[PDB]
Paper text:
Type III [name] systems are innate immune systems found in bacteria and archaea, which produce cyclic oligoadenylate (cOA) second messengers in response to viral infections. In these systems, [name] proteins serve as ancillary nucleases that degrade single-stranded RNA (ssRNA) upon activation by cOA. In addition, [name] proteins also possess cOA-degrading activity as an intrinsic off-switch to avoid degradation of host RNA and DNA that would eventually lead to cell dormancy or cell death. The two [name] monomers dimerize in an X-shape, and each monomer contains an N-terminal CARF domain, an intermediate helix-turn-helix (HTH) domain and a C-terminal HEPN domain.
In this study, we initially determined the crystal structure of [name] in complex with cA4 in its post-cleavage state, uncovering the mechanism of how [name] recognizes and cleaves cA4. The overall structure is similar to that of apo-[name], with a root-mean-square deviation (RMSD) value of 1.0 Å. Compared to the apo form, the CARF domain bound by A2 > P undergoes a significant movement in the mobile loop spanning residues from 165 to 179, which encloses the two A2 > P molecules into the catalytic pocket of CARF domain. The two A2 > P molecules bind to a composite site across the [name] dimer interface. The adenine group of A1/A1ˊ accepts two hydrogen bonds from residues T81 and E83, while their 2ˊ, 3ˊ-cyclic phosphate is stabilized by residues T59, K137 and R172. On the other hand, the adenine group of A2/A2ˊ is specifically recognized by R173 and E179 from the mobile loop, while the 2ˊ-OH group is stabilized by N164. Upon cA4 binding, the primary conformational change occurs in the CARF domain, where a mobile loop along with the two helices situated above the catalytic center switch from an open to a closed conformation, completely enclosing the cA4 molecule within the catalytic center. It is worth noting that while the CARF domain bound by A2 > P also displays a closed conformation compared to the apo form, it is noticeably distinct from the conformation observed in the cA4-bound state. On the contrary, these interactions were not observed in the A2 > P-bound structure, where the HTH domain adopts a conformation similar to that of the apo state. On the contrary, the conformation of HEPN domain including the R-X4-6-H motif in the A2 > P-bound state is essentially identical to that of the apo state.
Numbering used by the authors:
A (entry chain B): 1 to 45, 49 to 464
B (entry chain A): 3 to 44, 46 to 464
The structure:
Amino acid sequence: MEDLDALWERYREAVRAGGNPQALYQEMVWPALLALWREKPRVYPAFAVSVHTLGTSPEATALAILGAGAERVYVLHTPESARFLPRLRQDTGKDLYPVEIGKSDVEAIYREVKRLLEKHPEVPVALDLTSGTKAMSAGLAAAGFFFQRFYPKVRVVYVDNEDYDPELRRPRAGTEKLRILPNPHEALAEVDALFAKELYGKGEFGQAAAYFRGMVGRTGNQAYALYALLAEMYRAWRALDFGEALKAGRKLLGQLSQNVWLNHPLNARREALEAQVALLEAVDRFLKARDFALKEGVYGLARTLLHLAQEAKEEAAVLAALYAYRALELLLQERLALLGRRAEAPGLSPEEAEALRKALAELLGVLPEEVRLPAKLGLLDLLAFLRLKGDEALGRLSLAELRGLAGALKGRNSALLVHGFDVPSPKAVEGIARLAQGLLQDLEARTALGPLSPEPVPLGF
Amino acid sequence: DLDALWERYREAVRAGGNPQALYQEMVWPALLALWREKPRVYFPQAFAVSVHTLGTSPEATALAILGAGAERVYVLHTPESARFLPRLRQDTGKDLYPVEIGKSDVEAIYREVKRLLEKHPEVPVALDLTSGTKAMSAGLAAAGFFFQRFYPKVRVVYVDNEDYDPELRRPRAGTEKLRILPNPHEALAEVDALFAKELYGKGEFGQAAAYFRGMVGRTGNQAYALYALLAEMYRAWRALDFGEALKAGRKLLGQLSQNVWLNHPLNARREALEAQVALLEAVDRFLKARDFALKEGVYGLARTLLHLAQEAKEEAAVLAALYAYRALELLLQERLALLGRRAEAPGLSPEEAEALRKALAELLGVLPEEVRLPAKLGLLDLLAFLRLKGDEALGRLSLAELRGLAGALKGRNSALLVHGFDVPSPKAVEGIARLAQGLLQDLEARTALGPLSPEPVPLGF
């Protein structure tokens, strides 16, 4: 090695004397450097296959072949650099499997890497980008980091070096070292936040929380524990577990009020978070009481259900119907509470029951004698009853709209996930959600929560 | 023009002149002029920001800056390439924003690119990798393609050429052109299958179908259309849209029967597919008839609901309870039918009603007068009635087991998403689902389907 450092200087001074650079490199330097790499590869801390781009200088590639020490060696060369395959054979002693590519045909690099990984799918593979055009090297690296998703044993490698002489177009002999170029997730920790943020923006709150919690496990940065709490709060809220959501939100607000978290980015949104936690509190209170005097909790629950129905409208129509039916039922029951009455025991007088059978018969296209009122008012019975009692919000419904909704309202309990086998049309679910929305805006005006959305607050990064 | 200039340059070099100084004197002014007049840029592109690595080759970075035409220009240089910043300012005429990095510090590339995208989050940004070490260029490309996931307007760019003279270490003048380097996702069609197969493996059937549809177009290969149908069938099945699931499964089976597709990989799992489609057909039949003599459809619907309940139990227990209650209800009604009683309105004599009130009281630990029998039997009422009528499966349950189930069973209709406000424990869902599973295993033996799983068949690639 100090032999190598001494003859490097001998070479340098011979070049300053007028000796040719390439010739004296081949004669004085390269045999000793090559012998060193044969005996002892300068390799950072397993490869079964190595794949090497090949440009106009074969020496870097010879070193990378010896450093990876793979049994199977592929060489991605161009029509122009094919001339160097004999030298590669004689310097490495390896069988070469050559693949010709254009020097900036990045797609072909991608395709050849695909083909090779499919040929060697479960062994460690080194992708050496040292030699070639920037297009070849960058294409090989890009292909490697892309395919690690599906071929995790792939590694991108590089003959790093120290004293690159721009005149000599070579580094100082003996400073070369083969090493692994890390992928961005491996290299830069904060990029995990990006994955978490993406999942959060998709409504995948449980996975987002898992990512944030794993980041605290990786780096110890407790700022991401607060983000995990937030994602956990939304996970629980979207799953209708208002107790767990309230607990997570209260923990989060408590943490954000500590001096150490004063500049956490979620504090830029504190009021929004406080309002959402107030909503969760109100819903928790209403769920415990089951009493429709608690207007804020009725609003919070119906708002949550209508938002869930809107999100399920495309991918989950059966659930969308269920959410929309429950929201409308809650809102109609709150209207009945405006009259002091309860749907499970409305206390209909004989005159009221007769009038209700007549109105239901007109809506259902039957005779009043065919209408049988259950002990607990069904959804359509409740709507008809409120109209009979002069409810101002339901009185505004046209007869055409109500006739259009009558089939869907009548079949509330006949839904597949309640007691029957039916799925109403998406158009009817749309009409049920529209009716519910109008009742919700009436209630929203009468509640201390004001208008509030379940949409998540922006993360602030 | 530039052709004749390049021949004059090569001639002056042949005559012993200094290649680099002669490039600076004879070639570089004409090329720089040309890139100021009309830069050679492959379809013309508009960038707001450009980011440039800088090695020992400032000419390439000047061409890249002028080609990108960005208002804001960042230069990622090393301590060794810093001395080139003044000349790069003169050639381009731009205010440069320099950022220092080590020549192999790939983490530093990732960090600085991340900072710059955060500073310019919504504008098109060019990452020029032409000049620098291979670690710098490959790091910039890898950073670009990685961050495209989160910053879609990022592009990786490169000053390519038609010919490069390896002795002069220069592109042939006037053959340089600024090119976008494609990311491996957009350059390789076939990779979409791997993504689909990943999504399919995680049960994301809609996205898997979407990727399969994409592949059909980008390749010539209608084979992927079959995969798309399979994914659509599972999507519809999980969403409880049995009609659409059956439509897709029948279309798929009919295509797998054509001569062209006899070697399709799905035909390796043909038997399983056929069985799943028959289950779907039986469920579709049962949903139209709503009659518990159709044992196969009862089995298929209860099996589907129990699978969904098991999937939802841990993180969506409200929904899991809804699914598990429906599954258990169906199975108990089928067992009422099997006893020869009407499964939707068993006609209890006053003597049977009295006996059932006594049995429920002894069970619930209350007095008989505190038990009220609704017009529709609840789950607990129905289970106790089946036990009174000598049902053997249910007769095997112990008193301890029944009292452990009694709370959950009484809460069928008081579930939040039915008529009430209950938010259940995953433990209560587990009890309901385990009772249902036992009844399902009993019905399995009495059905022409036999045992079948809603678990997706392997793709076979």
